[PDB]
Ligand binder design. Structure first.
Ligand SMILES: [Zn+2]
Lengths: 142, 129, 97, 150
RNA sequence: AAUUUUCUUU
RNA sequence: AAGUUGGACAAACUUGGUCAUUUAGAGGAAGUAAAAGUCGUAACAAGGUUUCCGUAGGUGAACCUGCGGAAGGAUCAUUA
RNA sequence: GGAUAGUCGGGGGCAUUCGUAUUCAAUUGUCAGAGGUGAAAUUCUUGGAUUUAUUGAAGACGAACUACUGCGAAAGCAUUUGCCAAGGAUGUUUUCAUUAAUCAAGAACGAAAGUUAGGGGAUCGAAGACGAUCAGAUACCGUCGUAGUCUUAACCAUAAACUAUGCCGACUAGGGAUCGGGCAAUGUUUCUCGACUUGCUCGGCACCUUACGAGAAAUCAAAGUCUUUGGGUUCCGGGGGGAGUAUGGUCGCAAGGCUGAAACUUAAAGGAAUUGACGGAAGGGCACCACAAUGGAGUGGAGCCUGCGGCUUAAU
RNA sequence: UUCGAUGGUAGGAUAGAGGCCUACCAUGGUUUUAACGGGUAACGGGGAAUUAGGGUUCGAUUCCGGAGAGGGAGCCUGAGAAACGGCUACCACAUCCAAGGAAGGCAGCAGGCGCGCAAAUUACCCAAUCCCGACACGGGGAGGUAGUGACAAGAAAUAACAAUGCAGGGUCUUGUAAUUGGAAUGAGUACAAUGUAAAUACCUUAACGAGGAACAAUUGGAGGGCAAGUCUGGUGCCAGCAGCCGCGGUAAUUCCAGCUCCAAUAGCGUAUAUUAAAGUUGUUGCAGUUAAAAAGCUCGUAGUUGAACUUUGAGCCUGGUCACCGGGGUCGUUAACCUUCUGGCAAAACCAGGACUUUUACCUUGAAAAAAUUAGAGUGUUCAAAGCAGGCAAGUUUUGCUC
């Protein structure tokens, strides 16, 4: 079973220290992967430039076009994939719009049927989504 | 090999009590076992026990009367201060009124309540209720 | 799950047992796992006793027999119907019917 | 629980409750002490001393009449072997196994048994050096084990 | 002896 | 004072070995995901050669075979 | 722990003895098939195949006895005898006196297969060669057949290496078999012992019923004595792929062994059990919308009535 | 361990011990109880978040200690600096040059550029706290005050008294009001007193200041989780919604438009980090036959764990909160403060005071111990986040008392 001696504190502490690496949560914190190879170095949001738009296909059992775009980060140089939440915004969003990218809400995991996408766009041209949609704000003449 | 004799004694006693037998034979015996049993006797959970004095560790025959649920040992012998008695009672005893925790206090083997009265901590031996 | 407590063979207190050859398919089946039967057959059929007696010598000699030990594998025994698949309750019996 | 085996035998001798000299005996204490000394000069181990005295001469336990163990008697009267009997027997067994192995190198079972005996000898030697029965620089070498026995 | 295959749903 | 001779601390530069991290490259071999491809059917029933493990060989492929093991088998069973 | 007495063991090693079977070789007897398979087919046989009979050689293996039986730490160990070392249990009013349990690091053994040199190569048999089955058989089937299967001196070091269940210690329900030892019988039997019978006890291999108890259940006398959670001590896991992969280190002639990730992807993977369905699984039976019966009448083969596809047209 | 790594001698240097340095003599010191090396997106602590307990995470940052003033190195002054709002040289930058040269360092207070998801005025004042100096008199971007915000905590605008018929209820009371009307109205508007260095603000001041755009409450959701529609229209596996399951192929309670409802409230959602749940890190307190998991087996040293046994019980005195309990001394079982020093008695021996654990671990108490912070005692910031004050005292106004 487990050691139960009064002088086995070192043995118990060492075994717990070795075994805690098997924990998925502890490993993801102690490896530093957020600052080592992750697209986001712990940042909640990051600015980027739109590269292109990709029509990803939904997985089973759904079937639709996800209306995604590809965005190149300006502070890291890593090319990632972005998801536009609403409908009819890919026409408004053109190349080089200075978009803002954030997480999806699954702690960096793909949400729903969208394959291989982990980020979502929040602002376009520095004005914010759902503002130009309701015709409250307008895209600057850039 | 045998590590603690109190644990074997308490395991045999609780096994006999669960089985419903009115007597149990305990071997080996020791001073710690004797002090534990007299504490249980003065609290009323265990009836008379006869210590068979051999030219060895010695045996003992214990008369049971039910009315106990489980008597166990706490290994290793953790050091229990006065402030930790309440935590141990909440951790091990069924309630604040029913249940006895035995400590090998420097004054002697005694229940947790009278150890509190004497205002002296020690090392935890076991419990019974 | 364990279908059988003995794991299908009589191996208690052993580490290895020799393997025998099935008569039909010549498969290697362990000695404690092979189904054993003893064919004790008269050297002639019971329908030829009169013909043998009328064509024999030695004033009513004793007709010999043949003793053959047959060791089947699991698949061959099931196909030959010497051993049959039984219910779960009936699996726990060993006395021959 | 055998130290180097899986056996769980409990065979032993159960000494009587009466830790007294025999009620019907004429051992005379000192006569038995000189008798043990005579047998020690004859050259038999203390186990053989007790076995012969119990089986033939009729004294059940020597310490009951003498007041001390026979090893204590031998040490007091000076006939104390340098090597303890149990260690001497273990080393003699190891020598016999080593001789068997050197004449027959293919006995892997004997090699395994020699490893067990070597471990037992070292553990016993460590105990004896710790208690003080042997010099602290006792050590155990297979080359000189034959000379140690003889 | 010999017997391969059953698209994504309602 | 200007100036002179030695000593210690000693920034900094060229080179060589070592450590840590980051970053191109002609080319090569992998995994990872598919609304309705091509080849055939290995496994799940005795899956139609019972299955699996270790090892070795071979073949377009699932895979086949040799040797030794296991039932997680399709037998808890022939006392005569 | 050690000693001692009678034992016990298919425990180890060495030397030695015996058994039939397989293949082959020589010789003798008549002749037409022999092998093999569902069917065959390859192959060899009036030059004597196959069979029968005598003798010999080679290598492998110890059938039956052989078991819910034994031994060993495990892998494993099955012909006779002798020798050597060692081992468990039992008996003991024998000896020592805590000498003990479990382990990192480090070491011994480690099936089978695989490697390097020597010997030997009967049988089987990876690779392979043909010959049948099939649409394709590259496989399963038949014959031959190299490495291998045997052994010595060096290697490695893993298997479903399993009881998928670490080791030591205490307690816990009823019974009957079996092995080894011991105790008891004014017990039985056979020319002082053995065999058999009964009871008791210790240590093993297991078994039946049951569940005070446990588990998710299958089930378990331990997998019980755990929410009433603590006898002691090692190994090992933190959802599924990636992946026992990459890299690094280490051992190995090599094959490979040990240690052993990360990025990314995913909402499942998995275990036990239940009800249906299915089975080229089994056992009981039912059926001219099933078969047998030399079945009877027939249809399809001919020409026409009529219906359905296809063609055409304007709708057909 | 070369070029000081471990120790001895002697010397040098330092304010001072010291391999800090030098000459000689020995090979020593640490380490599986993890030495050494590497990483740290690591200044450390008081402390903060979650809270059965145990724990986990964070702590640049109002207090303490350390380091730095672009990276090093050296040095003067001074008691005190290896000081940078002191100096010197190199390295990387910026600047006027007449081309000879000169000259610096805001990780200080403001402000600018760039990196950025991410963070404020080129303001006033030494009045309060304190510091410096020759010193009542001077200075202090330390410090106090204010301008700016969506957020850090505490209090609360968007109302409300009746006539009215219907649904009513049981002669007393709620609601839909295309209705009225006189009421209390505060946000603001102005002014006065107070406040303050000057102010702003708070408090406070008469007085102007709603009849409906009055001076329009928002944020999400309305299938389960989890609370609130199978309502009406548009599309038809398309747009899309959607934290997971999941909805959508012409009846869409889950897509977008309207109506209404549900939750919080001047706040709500989203993205990320972390905590509880996670008994999925399990010492408390996991699991290993079949879900992931017992090394093929054995020996063996660190490590962990280690049978029993060495003075137990009975009877008193006295004083302590309730037939009860804790505490000090004794005599006999068996000798009852072992032993030492000092002082006394004296045939060795006895009494009193001090020391008294062989040696710990363990438990109890005390000492010295930073504050804030945590709990918490007292106390009319109108309550509260607060703060450490405050109170007496209406009938004299007493140049006091009390905490
Ligand atoms: Zn067969």
């Amino acid at each position: 079973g487990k050691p139960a001696g009064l002088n086995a504190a070192r043995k118990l502490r060492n075994h717990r220290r070795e075994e805690r690496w098997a924990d998925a949560h502890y490993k993801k914190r102690l490896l530093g992967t957020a600052y080592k190879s992750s697209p986001f170095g712990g940042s909640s949001h990051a600015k980027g430039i739109v590269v292109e738009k990709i029509g990803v296909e939904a997985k089973q059992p759904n079937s639709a076009i996800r209306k995604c775009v590809r965005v190149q980060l300006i502070k890291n140089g890593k090319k990632v994939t972005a998801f536009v939440p609403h409908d009819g915004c890919l026409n408004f969003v053109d190349e080089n719009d200075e978009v803002l990218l954030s997480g999806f809400g699954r702690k960096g995991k793909a949400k729903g049927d969208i394959p291989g996408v982990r980020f979502k766009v929040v602002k376009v041209a520095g004005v914010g989504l759902s503002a130009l949609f309701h015709e409250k704000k307008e895209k600057p003449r850039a | 090999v045998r590590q603690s004799v109190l644990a074997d004694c308490l395991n045999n006693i609780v096994n006999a009590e669960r089985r419903g037998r009115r007597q149990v034979l305990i071997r080996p015996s020791s001073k710690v076992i004797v002090k534990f049993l007299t504490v249980m006797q003065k609290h009323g959970y265990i009836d008379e026990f006869t210590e068979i004095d051999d030219h060895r560790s010695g045996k003992i025959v214990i008369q049971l009367n039910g009315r106990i649920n489980k008597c166990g040992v706490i290994s290793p012998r953790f050091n229990v201060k006065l402030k930790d008695i309440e935590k141990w009672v909440n951790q091990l005893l069924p309630s604040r009124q029913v249940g006895v925790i035995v400590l090998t206090t420097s004054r002697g083997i005694m229940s947790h309540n009278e150890a509190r009265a004497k205002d002296a901590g020690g090392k935890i031996l076991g419990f019974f209720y | 799950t364990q279908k059988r407590r003995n794991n299908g063979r009589n191996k208690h207190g052993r580490g290895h047992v020799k393997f025998v050859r099935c008569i039909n398919c010549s498969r290697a089946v362990p000695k404690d796992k092979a189904i054993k039967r003893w064919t004790i057959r008269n050297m002639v059929e019971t329908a030829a006793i009169r013909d043998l007696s009328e064509a024999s010598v030695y004033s009513e000699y004793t007709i010999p027999k043949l003793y053959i030990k047959l060791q089947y594998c699991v698949s061959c025994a099931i196909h030959s119907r010497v051993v049959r698949v039984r219910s779960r309750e009936g699996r726990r019996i060993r006395t021959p019917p | 629980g055998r130290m180097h085996s899986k056996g769980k035998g409990i065979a032993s001798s159960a000494l009587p409750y009466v830790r007294s000299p025999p009620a019907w005996c004429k051992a005379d204490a000192d006569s038995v002490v000189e008798q043990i000394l005579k047998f020690s000069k004859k050259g038999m181990s203390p186990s053989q001393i007790g076995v012969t005295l119990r089986d033939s001469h009729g004294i059940p336990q020597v310490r009951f009449i003498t007041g001390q163990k026979i090893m204590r008697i031998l040490k007091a009267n000076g006939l104390a072997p340098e090597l303890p009997e149990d260690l001497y027997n273990l080393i003699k067994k190891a020598v016999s196994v080593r001789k068997h192995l050197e004449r027959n190198r293919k006995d892997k079972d004997s090699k395994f048994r020699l490893i067990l005996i070597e471990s037992r000898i070292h553990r016993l030697a460590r105990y004896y050096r710790k208690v003080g029965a042997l010099p602290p620089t006792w050590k155990y070498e297979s080359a000189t084990a034959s000379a140690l026995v003889a």
